[PDB]
Amino acid sequence: GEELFTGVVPILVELDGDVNGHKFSVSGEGEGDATYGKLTLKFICTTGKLPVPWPTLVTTLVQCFARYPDHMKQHDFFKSAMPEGYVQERTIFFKDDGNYKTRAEVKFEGDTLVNRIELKGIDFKEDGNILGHKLEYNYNHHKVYITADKQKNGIKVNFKTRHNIEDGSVQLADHYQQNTPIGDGPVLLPDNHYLHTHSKLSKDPNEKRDHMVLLEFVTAAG
Ligand code: NI
């Protein structure tokens, strides 16, 4: 499981989404280097303009790339599910607004780590922060709390994210996350701990399509 992540791994992401009826797709390619906890990825909205802000999509758009320090390698659930993979399900509640519901499969396809996702968004306000496109194009750092869930043979994960708005306030998002394996094979069920994540968003100046360039570093602690 862990031996598939010793070098640079290529990554592919495929998202089909539906938010308040506005349908879209996003595709991403990049690579991940789990020894350093590094991800570099470029995403394109392939159906035109993206109907929600790119920041709301980041957490949906591969925690198996987290750097687990040596003293904690016995708590890396995500790499232990590989190569067959795990299913990731979330509900994300945006305070005073709507919510996303997501299901993704993460697994190897030959050499490539694949993250295939379905997303549904309901109850968003036409003039709210999301559909109204009022979020800044940036990303704060976060702690992602991970607990075992032994009766689903996986893990439960919860965190909040704070998205900046031009007026100084924030849009809060509360994530609730269940990961479970795809295989009938062994996995590691960790002790409680968290992931510390840093993310930088930017644009390719030679790209005319609606896109996002993403640099992420993720580290396990606690
Ligand atoms: Ni930090």
CATH code assigned at 200: 2.40.155.10
Could you tell me the distance, in angstroms and rounded to a whole number, from the CA of residue 145 to the centre of ligand 1? Answer: 15
Distance CA 151, CA 185 (A): 15
**For 109-113, which contacts have Cβ atoms below 8 Å and span 24 or more sequence positions?**
109/12, 111/9, 111/10, 112/9, 112/10, 112/11, 112/12, 113/9, 113/10, 113/11, 113/12, 113/32, 113/62, 113/64
Could you tell me the distance, in angstroms and rounded to a whole number, from the CA of residue 195 to the centre of ligand 1? Answer: 10
Could you tell me the distance, in angstroms and rounded to a whole number, from the CA of residue 211 to the centre of ligand 1? Answer: 26
Distance CA 213, CA 204 (A): 7
Could you tell me the distance, in angstroms and rounded to a whole number, from the CA of residue 198 to the centre of ligand 1? Answer: 6
Which amino acid appears at position 128 of this protein? G
Could you tell me the distance, in angstroms and rounded to a whole number, from the CA of residue 158 to the centre of ligand 1? Answer: 18
Distances (CA, A) of 26 to 109, 172, 199: 19, 23, 19
**Pair 102, 177: CB distance under 8 Å:** no
| Experimental method reported for this structure | X-ray
Instruction: Indicate the helix (H) or strand (E) that contains 141.
Output: none
Could you tell me the distance, in angstroms and rounded to a whole number, from the CA of residue 143 to the centre of ligand 1? Answer: 9
CA torsion sign for 44, 17, 101, 210 is positive
CA torsion sign for 136, 116, 219, 172 is positive
Which amino acid appears at position 41 of this protein? L
Domain that residue 2 falls in: 1-222
Could you tell me the distance, in angstroms and rounded to a whole number, from the CA of residue 194 to the centre of ligand 1? Answer: 13
Distance CA 139, CA 214 (A): 10
Distance CA 51, CA 18 (A): 9
**Pair 54, 103: CB distance under 8 Å:** no
When divided into structural domains, the chain yields a total of 1
Instruction: Indicate the helix (H) or strand (E) that contains 78.
Output: helix 77-80
Give 184's contacts (C-beta < 8 A, 6+ positions apart): none
Residue 45, strand partner residues: 26
Q: Which of the 8 DSSP states describes residue 69? A: P
Two tokens at 43? 């995403």
Where b means 16+ CB within 10 Å and e means fewer, 180-215 reads bbeeeeebbebeebbbbbebebeeeeeeeebbbbbe
